[PDB]
């Protein structure tokens, strides 16, 4: 694989292209509360919906602060469009830098996310203009490749993974139209099907601490190396993405847990999950669904290449993840078919979803990467080893 074209730094424009009449480019400063609020107001009413217009992602201000001011971030890559007259923010497209491994070639990239246009400005071909602008800002900073994810099919995806969903509060999910009552069944029966133990079972399990950063960093990198496409984590990215800072972050977004071996006290495993609510668009009974999404994890068990032993360790670790997410009042636990997730999703009672997540690279070509599913879009233990990165 490799880059499609080389960018001539000499020819990157110092000026942006023109915009629809009445609008202008604006760099966002997300360390300004007013501007974080304005981005949150845009996304909360205009970001991704489902096909039935029942739900809309509701990224919190805390999540936005976390997702967008990660190690290495530059305000130049938080791009807005404003109305010249009202000053209203009406469109956004954002990036943060990271390094990825693509079949053992390490690449410096931007991860692109939070592309959004106000409903009133849709279907005016503003997207290509937003894309071309952030591309120009990245080129000016010596970044020439990008990775991104979308729930829609666009030119040359690198992989595709299917969403899976583990009900934690089945009755809330039913009430908001997320989960069906099938059908010869009852509420009490679906609750039973979904019941979880009150307490975790992995010996040594505890919340991740700052002291664990180096050991978790080593285990995660070793683990992620078993994937064709992966995130090449730095120590600062371990600290930022996995260790919640309660002194400075009032609405927790990341949960991470480690397994401190009872005998050796070396961390032998870990997992994590993030908080992403959806607003429930029109429901007398509820206005939100509080989803937890499985994030990164690792286990020393993987290195045996004994798949039955990996499966058993993951069944235990992941059921503990479910227990902990329910304790922290999440309604549903979401995961994709990436990493080794096909090993546990169905047995731990995750239901197959209608959503898919497609992975894309800009200005980089590589063979299709397996995303955890067969041709029928079902989880397949022979289709793993491919996607090792979780985008937000």
Ligand X SMILES: Cc1nn(C)c(C)c1N(C(F)F)S(=O)(=O)c1c(Cl)cc(CCCC2CCNCC2)cc1Cl
Contacting positions for ligand MYA (CB under 6 A): 46-48, 110, 112-117, 122-128, 131, 134-135, 138, 143-146, 148, 150, 152, 154, 362
Q: How many residues bind ligand X (CB under 6 A)?
A: 18
Q: Which of 193, 354, 365, 381 binds ligand X (CB under 6 A)?
A: 354
Minimum distance of ligand X from residue 149's CB (angstroms): 5
Residue 234 marked ligand-binding: no
Nearer to ligand X, 54 or 83 (CB): 54
Minimum distance of ligand X from residue 54's CB (angstroms): 6
Residue 351 touches ligand X, criterion: CB under 6 A? no
> What phi and psi values does residue 88 have, to the nearest 5 degrees?
-60, 135
Which residues are within 8 A (CB) of 195 and not within 5 positions of it... i.e. 6 or more apart? none
353 binds, among ligand MYA, ligand X, none (CB under 5 to 8 A by kind): ligand X
Residue 145 touches ligand X, criterion: CB under 6 A? no
CB atoms inside a 10 Å sphere around CB 375: 7
How far is Cα 270 from Cα 244, in angstroms, rounded to an integer? 15
Is the Cβ–Cβ distance between 197 and 323 less than 8 Å?
A: yes
124 binds, among ligand X, ligand MYA, none (CB under 5 to 8 A by kind): ligand MYA
- Catalogue the E-assigned strands of the chain: 2-3, 23-27, 55-58, 78-83, 89-102, 105-117, 146-150, 159-167, 205-207, 229-231, 254-260, 267-280, 288-299, 332-335, 351-362, 364-365, 387-388
Residue 116 marked ligand-binding: yes
DSSP assignment of 20-47, as one string? STTEEEEE--TTSHHHHHHHHHHHHHHS
Nearer to ligand MYA, 56 or 162 (CB): 56
Nearer to ligand MYA, 55 or 144 (CB): 144
Using CA atoms, how far residue 273 sits from 106, 184, 242, 284, in Å, is 26, 34, 9, 29
Minimum distance of ligand X from residue 184's CB (angstroms): 24
Task: Give catalytic residue positions.
Answer: 392
Question: Which span sits near ligand X by CB under 6 A: 60-68, 97-105, 131-139, 350-358?
Answer: 350-358
Q: Which of residues 18-37 bind ligand X (CB under 6 A)?
A: none
Residue that the structure tokens 């009974």 belong to: 285
How far is Cα 127 from Cα 115, in angstroms, rounded to an integer? 8
How far is Cα 29 from Cα 79, in angstroms, rounded to an integer? 9
CB atoms inside a 10 Å sphere around CB 323: 18
Residue 287 touches ligand X, criterion: CB under 6 A? no
295 binds, among ligand X, ligand MYA, none (CB under 5 to 8 A by kind): none
Residue 119 marked ligand-binding: no
Which residues belong to the annotated binding site for tetradecanoyl-CoA?
A: 115-117, 123-127
By the criterion CB under 6 A, which residues form the site for ligand X?
48-50, 55-57, 149-151, 163, 178, 278, 289, 334, 353-355, 357
């Amino acid at each position: 694989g490799g880059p499609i074209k080389i960018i001539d730094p000499e020819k990157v424009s110092k000026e942006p292209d023109a915009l629809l009449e009445g609008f202008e480019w604006a760099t966002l400063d997300l360390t300004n509360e007013t501007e974080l609020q304005e981005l949150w107001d845009l996304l909360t009413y205009h970001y991704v919906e489902d096909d039935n217009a029942m739900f809309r992602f509701r990224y919190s201000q805390s999540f936005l602060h976390w997702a967008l001011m990660s190690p290495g971030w530059k305000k130049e890559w938080h791009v807005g469009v404003r109305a010249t007259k009202s000053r209203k923010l009406v469109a956004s497209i954002c990036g943060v830098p990271t390094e990825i491994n693509v079949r053992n070639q390490k690449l410096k990239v931007v991860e692109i996310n939070f592309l959004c246009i106000h409903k009133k400005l849709r279907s005016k071909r503003l997207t290509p203009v937003l894309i071309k602008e952030i591309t120009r800002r990245c080129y000016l900073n010596g970044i020439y490749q990008a990775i991104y994810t979308a729930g829609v099919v666009l030119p040359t995806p690198v992989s595709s993974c299917r969403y899976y969903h583990r009900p934690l509060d089945w009755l809330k999910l039913y009430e908001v139209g997320f989960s069906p009552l099938p059908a010869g069944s009852t509420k009490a029966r679906q609750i039973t099907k979904n019941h979880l133990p009150s307490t975790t079972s992995t010996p040594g399990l505890r919340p991740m601490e700052p002291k664990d950063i180096d050991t978790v960093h080593d285990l995660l990198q070793r683990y992620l190396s078993r994937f064709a496409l992966n995130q090449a984590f730095t120590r600062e990215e371990v600290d930022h993405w996995l260790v919640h800072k309660p002194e400075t972050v009032k609405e927790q977004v990341v949960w991470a847990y480690v397994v401190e071996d009872p005998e050796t006290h070396k961390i032998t495993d870990f997992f994590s999950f993030y908080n992403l609510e959806s607003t429930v668009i029109q429901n007398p009974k509820h206005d939100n669904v509080r989803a937890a999404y499985l994030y990164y994890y690792a286990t020393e068990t993987a290195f045996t290449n004994n798949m039955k032993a990996l499966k058993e360790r993951l069944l235990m670790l992941m059921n503990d993840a479910l227990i902990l997410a329910k304790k922290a009042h999440f309604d549903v636990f979401n995961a994709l078919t990436l990493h080794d997730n096909p090993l546990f999703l169905e047995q731990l009672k995750f239901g197959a979803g209608d959503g898919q997540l497609h992975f894309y690279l800009y200005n980089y070509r590589t063979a299709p990467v397996p995303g955890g599913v067969n041709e029928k879009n079902l989880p397949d233990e022979k289709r793993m080893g491919g996607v090792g990165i979780v985008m937000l």
